[PDB]
């Protein structure tokens, strides 16, 4: 009888909610009440990267904080030199419906995928000098929404088939499958040590995964609608999510619950992308209303705006040295802010 | 000698921007269409030297609210219609009223003309039981029926067309248009509607519409 099972899970949900309630002795807004505000954050567009034909869904910075790959639904991966605005590579894709792209930490590979249900690895350092497909990782039964390299040989992907997968790139095989989401998994974020990662899905839920074990450590709720974006805090103990309910939220791994909500009455559009600054004091979020809002992550006060884009802000990333922010958009331009 | 390598980077950049100009010509000359009825199937067809790329989604789950945003900038969505009829009306309603598909035109193909022609002979359930307001519906006077068919197939055809035009005329605002078909060549009908879509897009930039 599933009804008896369905009511045991009701009791466990109340037990978890009571354990979380016991730990909520104070709020992060009370702990940070006496600290100074960050003031007004006024970033300016320093670069505008032009050359994509269609809308951009994904960008990813290189670990050298100079090169970055962007993915456009015209069917191109472009690696840019952000210092000089020069294009380094332009990779034509077999399928033009790309929704995610990743830059390997070594700089030797890029990955992309989308509605073809395939993650494609591209070798950037081929002996001849051209850029060719290294592997095509097949096995997902829904579109790829995010992918992130662990190293040159491991990449973790999230999919519209409600799962996440860990791949061995050389063998092309799916090492681990991460099941438990009931909606499309839309975003994933690797922990700083790459032992864990978080994934947000279209069930208004975020989950924390053990990469080695293949099992879900914690589930985080509190959002009202689909989670579009997720990003770890710099020290790996917290993460922020952006949802279609027009709010950002901050969850903590060790307290196992929400700490802040970053919302305003004037904001009624969904968040498409989130990212933290180098110290984690600023939470940057891209929105459907064509803007990016800078949030004081400790006080939940809007500290600034990035207002340069004419269409939907689809993606957003901060350099590993904290030096610059890049935003892609459905108007087919990337902007570097600083 | 950083200027020696900055010259090399500027050389490789102009080579890329040269290819991107050839790619721009191909991209702007092709009309891409979404067909709604491994991860996605691509069909290339050509009508009067115009290139059409039709994309049919396969191996995607029945939840569409995320991956359907990828097609906000197709020339048109081709909506093929097979209570399966009310479900198609609800799907068309949410496409028509989605904030990202609000400038995308829809070409309706009310499929199964022969099936609707044969089902209506004392076996008609999909329009009479599910739509009781059809029993008091009359074929419009400006109807153009096919020469030779039941007078009750043309009534069911125009009722279904008016069910869809009721959704599309509510909040159309002259940004996207609905082209209903099969109530009266399918590639030609797509080509003609795409030409009308492109013309209306240009006449809006010149403020002539």
């Amino acid at each position, epitope marked *: 009888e599933l009804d008896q099972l369905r009511q045991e899970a009701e009791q466990l949900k109340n037990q978890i909610r009571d354990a979380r309630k016991a730990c909520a002795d104070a709020t992060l807004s009370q702990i940070t009440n006496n600290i100074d505000p960050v003031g007004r954050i006024q970033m300016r567009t320093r670069r505008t990267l032009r050359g994509h034909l269609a809308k951009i869904y994904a960008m990813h910075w290189g670990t050298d904080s100079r090169l970055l790959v962007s993915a456009s639904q015209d069917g191109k991966l472009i690696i840019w030199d952000s210092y000089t605005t020069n294009k380094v590579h332009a990779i034509p894709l077999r399928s033009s419906w790309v929704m995610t792209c990743a830059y390997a930490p070594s700089g030797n590979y890029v990955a992309c995928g989308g509605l073809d249900n395939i993650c494609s690895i591209y070798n950037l350092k081929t002996r001849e000098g051209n850029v060719r497909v290294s592997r095509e990782l097949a096995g997902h039964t829904g579109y790829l929404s995010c992918c992130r390299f662990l190293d040159d040989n491991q990449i973790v992907t999230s999919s519209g088939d409600t799962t996440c997968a860990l791949w061995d790139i050389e063998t092309g095989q799916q090492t681990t499958t991460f099941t438990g989401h009931t909606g499309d998994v839309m975003s994933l974020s690797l922990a700083p040590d790459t032992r864990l990662f978080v994934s947000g899905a279209c069930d208004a839920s975020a989950k924390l995964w053990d990469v080695r074990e293949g099992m879900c450590r914690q589930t985080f709720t509190g959002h009202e*609608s689909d989670i579009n974006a997720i990003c770890f805090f710099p020290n790996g103990n917290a993460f922020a999510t952006g949802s279609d309910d027009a709010t950002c939220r901050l969850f903590d791994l060790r307290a196992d619950q929400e700490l802040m909500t970053y919302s305003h009455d004037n904001i009624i559009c969904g968040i498409t992308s989130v990212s933290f600054s180098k110290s984690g004091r600023l939470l940057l979020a891209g929105y459907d209303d064509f803007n990016c809002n800078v949030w004081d992550a400790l006080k939940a006060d809007r500290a600034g705006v990035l207002a340069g884009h004419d269409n939907r802000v689809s993606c957003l990333g901060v350099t590993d040295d904290g030096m610059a922010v890049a935003t892609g958009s459905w108007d087919s331009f990337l902007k570097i802010w600083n | 000698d950083q200027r020696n390598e900055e010259k090399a980077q500027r050389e490789a950049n102009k080579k890329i921007e040269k290819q991107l100009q050839k790619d721009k010509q191909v991209y702007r000359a092709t009309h891409r269409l979404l067909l709604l009825g491994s991860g996605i199937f691509e069909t290339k067809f050509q009508v009067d030297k115009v290139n059409f790329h039709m994309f049919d989604v396969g191996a995607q789950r029945d*939840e569409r609210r995320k991956w359907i945003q990828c097609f906000n900038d197709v020339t048109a969505i081709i909506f093929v219609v097979a209570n399966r009829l009310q479900a198609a009306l609800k799907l068309f309603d949410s496409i028509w009223n*989605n904030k990202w598909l609000r400038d995308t035109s829809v070409i309706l193909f009310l499929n199964k003309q022969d099936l609707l022609a044969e089902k209506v002979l004392a076996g008609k359930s999909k329009i009479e039981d599910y739509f009781p307001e059809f029993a008091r519906y009359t074929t419009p006077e400006d109807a153009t029926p096919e020469p030779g068919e039941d007078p009750r197939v043309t009534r069911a055809k125009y009722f279904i067309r008016d069910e869809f035009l009721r959704i599309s005329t509510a909040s159309g605002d002259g940004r996207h248009y609905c082209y209903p078909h099969f109530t009266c060549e399918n590639i030609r009908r797509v080509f003609n509607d795409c030409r009308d879509i492109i013309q209306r897009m240009h006449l809006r930039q010149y403020e002539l519409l």
Partner: nanobody
Amino acid sequence: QVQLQESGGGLVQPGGSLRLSCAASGFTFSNYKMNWVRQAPGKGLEWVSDISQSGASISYTGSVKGRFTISRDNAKNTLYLQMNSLKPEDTAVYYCARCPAPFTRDCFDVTSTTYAYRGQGTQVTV
């Protein structure tokens, strides 16, 4: 956490009446358009009725116009379906389905097999 809990179903004589309630929890109820969806034995999920955020725009599937009436009470976070003149083909599991995103006109995927913002349903037998 988003939670929809249906109640008020049960066995009823043909021609009888029945009132279903949906207790909403975990979201701003008034920001969302709400739907009723049913799954008859052997069939797939089928849309029944919807109501807009305020309660003004109301629609029904054709086979229930005049017999069913939908209402929401935004103060109590409750959605209602009042069913009159019930027919033997109204036997189904009735689900309270929330639209995916707030402040929207479109409502995608509420009749999908694994839609998340849908309750466990309540059985209505005629």
